[PDB]
Write a protein that binds this ligand. Sequence first.
Ligand SMILES: *[C@@H]1O[C@H](CO)[C@@H](O[C@@H]2O[C@H](CO)[C@@H](O)[C@H](O)[C@H]2NC(C)=O)[C@H](O)[C@H]1NC(C)=O
Length: 361
Amino acid sequence: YKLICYYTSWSQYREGDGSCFPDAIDPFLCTHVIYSFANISNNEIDTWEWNDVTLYDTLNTLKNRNPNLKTLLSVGGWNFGPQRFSKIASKTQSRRTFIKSVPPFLRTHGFDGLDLAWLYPGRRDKRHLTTLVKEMKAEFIREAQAGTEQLLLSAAVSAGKIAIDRGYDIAQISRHLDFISLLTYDFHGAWRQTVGHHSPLFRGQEDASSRFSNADYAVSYMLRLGAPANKLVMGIPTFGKSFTLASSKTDVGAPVSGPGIPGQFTKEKGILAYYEICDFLQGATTHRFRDQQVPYATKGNQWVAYDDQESVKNKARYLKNRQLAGAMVWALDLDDFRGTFCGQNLTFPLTSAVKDVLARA
Ligand SMILES: *[C@@H]1O[C@H](CO)[C@@H](O[C@@H]2O[C@H](CO)[C@@H](O)[C@H](O)[C@H]2NC(C)=O)[C@H](O)[C@H]1NC(C)=O
């Protein structure tokens, strides 16, 4: 089974123990580590952070300890306007320029592959996305003639039904991609003026509006659209989503006034790292959607939807039962990587729980 793990370059800037460098990553934890977010300048892949070349080097030296480990560099991301991808992919000449520049860059810095994070193809982009994947893959096949192991090609894809139908030709891109990571953790957010879980496993016979907003539906849908199980990877979040309650109501459907206040370390409204959640739990009330199989917690006027060891193990057993290729974990730097915030004396408690289930039959 694959265990695909993202590392984000901006995590280095967090203060105190929040600061995370590639050097903190256990080489034997994941099968694949993806460094997050390369830029595109002059229609060519390029670094983003001033010290990326150094961090690339730190990450890729984990392979001196685990020669089986593969690394990928992901292009795009949220702070990368999709309009920009759109421009690049729409023109055969801009597209070819971007594609030709990829292999030499990956080779220079020691990556084994490229991950596409076009955070969302519009209706007018579907066709060009297909072209980008096709031609990128053809170029990697050509480059392998030089005698070096063929570069891997992956993509991070929306798990939202409407977004899927709108921007992706799943049957087509699936045959050119080595794996497809499903972003099965964005089924809610401030977005809706009410409380809800962003990463439910099942629909839960309670709510019946966006029956499509759960991991199970997305997986089933992808399989039906033609993505082979053996290339599908289910995304598992290592962060939580917070909300500021508009009332004393805590149960499902409770009114929300906006996102929660930022954590001490991640400093971003609406999100908390798992290590920040562990600190938050002391004094909070914990609940669990038995239907959806995921927990939430509340303290004062703050409501948090998150995943714990149990929910992550549960998701991991599900993916095995469906014979998927593995799991993807969004953000090693958001898990308790120091292993000093969450009781138990364990580094990467969430990611490790996933690996253990996967290690089993
Ligand atoms: C990502 O690359 C783009 C394209 O080179 C950079 O954006 C350009 O910045 C120049 C000079 O800073 C500006 O005048 C342009 O308006 C920018 N254009 C676009 C489309 O972004 C961008 O700075 C890079 N991002 C990094 C390194 O964080």
